[PDB]
RNA sequence: GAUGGUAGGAUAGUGGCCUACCAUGGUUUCAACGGGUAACGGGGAAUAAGGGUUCGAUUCCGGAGAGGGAGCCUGAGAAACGGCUACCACAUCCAAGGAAGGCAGCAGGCCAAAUUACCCAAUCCUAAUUCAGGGAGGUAGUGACAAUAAAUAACGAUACAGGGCCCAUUCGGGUCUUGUAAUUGGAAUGAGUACAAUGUAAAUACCUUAACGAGGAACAAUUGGAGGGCAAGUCUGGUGCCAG
RNA sequence: AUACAGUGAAACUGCGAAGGCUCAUUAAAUCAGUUAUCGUUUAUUUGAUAGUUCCAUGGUAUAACUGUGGUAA
């Protein structure tokens, strides 16, 4: 059954509508998600 | 209900649009219940898709049981309790109770080498061997998702190492850290919470690609051109893959159908279905080919070839371990071992498997030689192909389950399957100055395995060195050379003082099979209830059973390898070994100099290897004592395993010399049962054992000569009469076979022998007849060498008679 | 083993029930032995009913069976609806290593595929018990075969007309308070809507029953038959205006 | 209530289910009554019904339970 939510996965046009170390994961999803953009090299001056 | 992210569905969309695999790494506890959603997204991105799913785990499932009658009666008694209604299933229960899941342990990953899956669920992260990684991400196909679940210790390592360079704090493992950094580098991989949020540390930006295959259309065009008989039927049955594989099958068919002899050897990677092309060409060869064919695979390892043979036969016209017997209905084929079918090679066609080079030269002589060269040595086999046989050997490397994949690129980069044989030196004559210098530096393996770009390029050079034409090692051996406690390395590459650059002249991996350090590491690892890191000590601790070797620490060579240029490369390896003996005797940067002047308290230094001739010559330039071997035929090459161990320490010379003496005493008797190898190499081994005894002993293990009454009891008086009959008459077997055992024993005991007389003593020790051993070795003057052997026997009999009697 | 004798075996014991030995018996025209069914029928097998005279209450058709024969086990009672072993077929899971039970079953259907809900309150049965229970058993619901008794109106007043009805082939004859979408009046209650209480383990239903409930009493029964009549209408025929 | 003391998942226990469908056609041998068993079994019901003793309390071995595990189960 597309256009409906078989389980929880309701399919819109392009978006998907689903539903439902602790503080470490919550902080890495709150602030430190794309904070590791300029953290790749760590002075790797190759 | 909540919209998830603009990137995680779009990644699956463009992954199935470009037919590329993709990697999800999920953290958190409630992570099993989001594989329903990712499998639904993977199917609805493109219905025309494989449905099966792997659940590789190591010891125990997460929250379920994988037995549907068991969980069915469990949910039946849950109904009978009444905490849950009848027609109710949460999506994880529905996912495991409706989908097609194949369950494997992490140990038996070799059981699923052939089949194909749409999804792979790696359950545990902390133990992930790279051979298992290479076996699962290869079988995941182009619309595929490989998901990896995590643990709180890995979350601590993630929060640590996601800042710049820090690690986790207690054998420490860096392969999983190199894994985390590679997934941070990958564009087709990202890390997701248990709540379907995003950690953008691994491939942050991802756009939805635009809505829409020329090599596939060229494949269809050339396939239809070949279509417009039974040759086209075989071509369409084979070409389930790239036009490279189709062109290879067509060219092998053209060069091996009616031309009866060519030597065609198709070389390819782990993909592309080389065995599939062989088994799909088998039916065409049975049609337009001889009545007998000869396969040379491993025994009971011909799954894809036999499956494609039966599949193509059923396509065209058909109907102690396993069954590999020959069948026909309107043909013969046998998957045999090494060439015991020399007189049974009436088959005009033989197809061999990938690399035993001398056994390959023995088997491939008088028929059409098809050969499958899997990459998974090759240069030397191509040289032996060009050194003899209209060789039309050609094949290509386009993938089968993809056209090209960043997941395959990251897997090859992390598991280090990529190689490069470029020079990149200062000079070869200036590397000969390094061969005069014998200068070596340590590896600093923590900073080496920390994935940085130039460090990874030099580490790929080091891996190409450490597995360059080696003795068939593997990715689990790379993980042992990375993440073991008893390990070190040495890169004696450059002598020059130029700018940033260099090479790898010789890698050499040590293994501290110790007493103190190994006892410390083993008492540590007994809390983790595992551990096996003492091979060279434990072989002699049962064979020779010495408390001295129980108390002395030891370094053991895991591997050591140099370039494949010339004999100067063996000179470079000898200089590296001599520099290592000098090194034993006399974040972080990815080298060491002061630690190259540092070591441990080690007594013995040994290398364990197979009994090879050049390895024996290297062991003699090494001159490390040729200690106790084992003549059990290790079925890879059939080579006997010898562990030559020097003692380079304060006071161990009497122990090592007595061990060499016991090995020498055992070898002359053990050359009768299961050591019938050579004459010159046997003399070299006896000379190496006596050289070890002479170098180690001063006058301690100095044996007395053959005593009078004991020598009278060892022979007979009439046996010595027959010896005199050989001295003044013929040396026939009525007096030269009953006494020859004691003759060869006393000759190898203790007053000199020639080269022909030494081969005669070794020939009587090997107990072969006259026309075999001397005619194989010298191949000249058979009866004259037999008379010289009789004269040496007469001189020995005259010496023993004039000594005792 | 036919008939009996003697002894043993096995039995819960009697017993040719089985075996050794011995004798050649035994039933029968005073019906042996054998032949079949309205032996889905009969025999009392039993209750009988205040008029049904072989319809009209029930026990039992014969023995088996728990996939198929075989062997074993348990118990006051068994060759167990609930056990095991081996053989042969069905048959599901399986990671292909192995673990099983029986569902090769019972319900249904060939323009009525829904029975499978509530109780031991009654009668019995088991029960350590002044307690527990019994899919024994009872209660209720969907699932019409127009078979069954009632309703869809009753009673007045006023007005205004002169015609209504019957017979007969015909002419005609015979007779008499009869009509009308005319007005109008207050009484009646029943279907329905519903208080309850009774009933009952409980609930339904029957029984009893306050309140409301009629004018198109629209709170709106059918089915079939006989005959007309009409247009600036349409069609056909042809000796105007007609015939069909 | 410092050797037990009430709620009580899961385990031993006492008992529960204490009598249900289809298929091939047996003529007092299937059945009903009756005579008897000092010819015999019997839980339960009921009435009855036990006489040998030289120079202050008897033994480890298993659960449930903990702990280490295997197996797809």
Swiss-Prot record, chain A:
Top-level lineage group? Eukaryota
Q: Where in the cell is it found?
A: Cytoplasm; Nucleus, Nucleolus
Q: Give the similarity note.
A: Belongs to the TRAFAC class translation factor GTPase superfamily. Bms1-like GTPase family. BMS1 subfamily.
Q: What does this protein do?
A: GTPase required for synthesis of 40S ribosomal subunits and for processing the 35S pre-rRNA at sites A0, A1, and A2. Controls access of pre-ribosomal RNA intermediates to RCL1 during ribosome biogenesis by binding of RCL1 in a GTP-dependent manner and, via its affinity to U3 snoRNA, delivering it to pre-ribosomes. GTP-binding and/or GTP hydrolysis may induce conformational rearrangements within the BMS1-RCL1 complex allowing the interaction of RCL1 with its RNA substrate. Required for RCL1 import into the nucleus.
Assembly and interaction partners: Interacts directly with RCL1 and the U3 snoRNA to form a stable subcomplex. Component of the 90S small subunit processome also known as 90S pre-ribosome that consists of the 35S pre-rRNA, early-associating ribosomal proteins most of which are part of the small ribosomal subunit, the U3 snoRNA and associated proteins.
Q: What is this protein called?
A: Ribosome biogenesis protein BMS1
Give the stretch of the parent protein shown, with its full length.
356 to 414 of 1183
Swiss-Prot record, chain B:
Q: What is its main location?
A: nucleus
Query: Could you list the residue ranges that cross the membrane?
Result: none
Q: What happens when the gene is disrupted?
A: Leads to a strong inhibition of 18S rRNA synthesis. Deletion results in an altered alkali-soluble beta-glucan phenotype. Heterozygous mutants show haploinsufficiency in K1 killer toxin resistance.
Q: Which Gene3D superfamilies match?
A: 3.40.50.11040, 3.40.630.30, P-loop containing nucleotide triphosphate hydrolases
**Keywords, alphabetical:** Acyltransferase, ATP-binding, Nucleotide-binding, Nucleus, Phosphoprotein, rRNA processing, Transferase, tRNA processing
One biological process term in Gene Ontology: rRNA acetylation involved in maturation of SSU-rRNA
Q: What InterPro entries would the database entry show?
A: GNAT_dom (IPR000182), NAT10 (IPR033688), NAT10/TcmA_helicase (IPR007807), P-loop_NTPase (IPR027417), TmcA/NAT10/Kre33 (IPR032672), TmcA_N (IPR013562), tRNA_bind_dom (IPR027992)
Q: Can the keyword Nucleotide-binding be found in this entry's annotation?
A: yes
Q: Which reaction does it catalyse?
A: a cytidine in 18S rRNA + acetyl-CoA + ATP + H2O = an N(4)-acetylcytidine in 18S rRNA + ADP + phosphate + CoA + H(+); a cytidine in tRNA + acetyl-CoA + ATP + H2O = an N(4)-acetylcytidine in tRNA + ADP + phosphate + CoA + H(+)
Outcome when changing residue 470 to A: Total loss of 18S rRNA acetylation and tRNA acetylation
The UniProt annotation places ATP binding at 268-277, 400
This chain's function reads: RNA cytidine acetyltransferase with specificity toward both 18S rRNA and tRNAs. Catalyzes the formation of N(4)-acetylcytidine (ac4C) at positions 1280 and 1773 in 18S rRNA. Required for early nucleolar cleavages of precursor rRNA at sites A0, A1 and A2 during 18S rRNA synthesis. Catalyzes the formation of ac4C at position 12 in serine and leucine tRNAs. Requires the tRNA-binding adapter protein TAN1 for full tRNA acetyltransferase activity but not for 18S rRNA acetylation.
Listed under subunit, the entry gives: Interacts with TAN1. Associates with 90S pre-ribosomal particles.
Family under the similarity heading: Belongs to the RNA cytidine acetyltransferase family. NAT10 subfamily.
User: What is this protein's name?
Assistant: RNA cytidine acetyltransferase
């Amino acid at each position: 059954a597309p256009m409906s939510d078989v389980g929880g996965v309701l399919m819109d046009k392009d978006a998907v509508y689903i539903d439902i170390e602790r503080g470490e994961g919550e902080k890495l999803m709150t602030g430190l998600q794309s904070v590791e953009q300029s953290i790749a090299e760590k002075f790797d001056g190759v | 209900k909540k919209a998830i992210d603009s990137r995680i569905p779009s990644l699956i969309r463009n992954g199935v649009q470009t037919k590329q695999r993709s990697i999800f790494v999920i953290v958190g506890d409630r992570a099993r219940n989001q594989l329903p959603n990712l499998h639904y997204l993977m199917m609805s991105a493109d219905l025309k898709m494989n449905k099966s799913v792997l659940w590789a785990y190591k010891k125990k499932l997460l929250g379920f049981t994988s037995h549907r009658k068991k969980r069915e009666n469990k949910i039946k008694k849950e109904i009978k309790r009444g905490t849950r209604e009848v027609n109710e299933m949460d999506p994880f229960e529905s996912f495991i109770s409706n989908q097609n899941i194949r369950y494997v342990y992490y140990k038996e990953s070799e059981k699923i080498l052939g089949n194909t899956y749409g999804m792979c669920i790696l359950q545990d992260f902390e133990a992930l061997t790279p051979n298992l990684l290479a076996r699962t991400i290869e079988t995941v196909e182009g619309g595929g998702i490989v998901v990896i679940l995590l643990k709180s210790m890995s979350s601590l390592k993630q929060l640590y190492t996601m800042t710049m360079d820090v690690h986790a704090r207690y054998v420490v493992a860096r392969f999983n850290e190199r894994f985390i950094l590679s997934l941070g580098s990958n564009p087709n991989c990202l890390v997701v919470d248990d709540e379907l949020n995003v950690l953008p540390l691994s491939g942050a930006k991802n756009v939805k690609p635009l809505p829409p295959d020329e090599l596939p259309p060229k494949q269809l065009e050339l396939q239809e051109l070949k279509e417009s008989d039974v040759q086209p039927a075989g071509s369409l049955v084979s070409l389930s893959k790239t036009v490279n594989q189709a062109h290879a099958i067509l060219s092998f068919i053209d060069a091996i159908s009616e031309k009866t002899v060519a030597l065609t050897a198709g070389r390819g990677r782990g993909k592309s279905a080389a065995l599939g092309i062989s088994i799909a060409a088998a039916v065409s060869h049975g049609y337009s080919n001889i009545f007998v064919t000869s396969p040379s695979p491993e025994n009971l390892k011909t799954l894809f070839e036999f499956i494609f043979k039966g599949f193509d036969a059923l396509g065209y016209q058909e109907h102690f371990n396993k069954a590999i017997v020959r069948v026909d209905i309107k043909q013969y084929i046998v998957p045999q071992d090494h060439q015991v079918l020399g007189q049974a090679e009436l088959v005009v066609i033989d197809e061999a498997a990938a690399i035993i080079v001398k056994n390959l030269l023995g088997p491939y002589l008088v028929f059409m030689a098809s050969t499958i060269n899997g990459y998974e040595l090759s240069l030397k086999l191509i040289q032996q192909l060009r050194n003899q046989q209209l060789r039309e050997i050609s094949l290509d490397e386009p993938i089968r389950y993809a056209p090209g994949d960043p997941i395959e690129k990251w897997l090859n980069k992390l598991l280090c399957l990529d190689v490069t044989l470029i020079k990149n030196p200062r000079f070869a004559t200036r590397g000969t100055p390094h061969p005069s210098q014998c200068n070596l530096f340590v590896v600093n393996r923590d900073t080496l395995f920390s994935y940085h770009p130039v460090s990874e390029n030099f580490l790929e050079k080091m891996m190409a060195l450490y597995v360059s034409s080696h003795y068939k090692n593997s990715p689990n051996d790379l993980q042992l050379m990375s993440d073991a406690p008893a390990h070190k390395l040495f890169v004696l590459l450059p002598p020059i003082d130029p700018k940033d650059g260099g090479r790898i002249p010789d890698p050499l991996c040590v293994i501290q099979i110790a007493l103190e350090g190994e006892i410390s590491k083993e008492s540590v690892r007994n809390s983790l209830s595992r551990g096996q890191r003492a091979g060279g000590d434990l072989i002699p601790w049962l064979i020779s059973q010495q408390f001295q070797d129980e108390e002395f620490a030891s370094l053991s060579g895991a591997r050591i390898v140099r370039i494949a240029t010339n004999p100067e490369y063996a000179s470079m390896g000898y200089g590296s070994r001599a520099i290592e003996l000098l090194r034993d005797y006399f974040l972080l940067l990815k080298l060491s100099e002061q630690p190259p002047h540092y070591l441990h308290y080690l007594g013995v230094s040994y290398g364990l290897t197979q009994s090879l001739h050049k390895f024996w010559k290297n062991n003699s330039f090494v001159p490390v004592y040729l200690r106790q071997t084992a003549n059990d035929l290790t079925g890879e090459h059939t080579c006997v395993m010898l562990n030559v161990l020097e003692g380079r320490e304060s006071n161990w010379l009497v122990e090592f010399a007595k061990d060499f003496r016991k090995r020498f005493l055992s070898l002359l008797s053990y050359d009768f049962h299961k050591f019938t190898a050579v004459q010159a190499l046997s003399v070299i081994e006896s000379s190496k054992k006596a050289q070890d005894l002479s170098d180690d002993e001063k006058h301690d293990n100095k044996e007395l000569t053959r005593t009078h009454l004991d020598d009278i009891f060892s022979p007979f008086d009439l046996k010595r009469l027959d010896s005199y009959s050989n001295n003044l008459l013929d040396y026939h077997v009525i007096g030269d076979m009953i006494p020859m055992l004691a003759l060869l024993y006393f000759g190898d005991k203790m007053s000199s022998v020639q080269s022909a007389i030494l081969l005669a003593i070794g020939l009587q020790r090997k107990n072969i007849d006259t026309i075999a051993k001397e005619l194989n070795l010298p191949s000249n003057q058979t009866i004259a060498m037999f008379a010289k052997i009789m004269r040496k026997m007469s001189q020995y009999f005259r010496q023993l008679l004039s000594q005792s009697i």
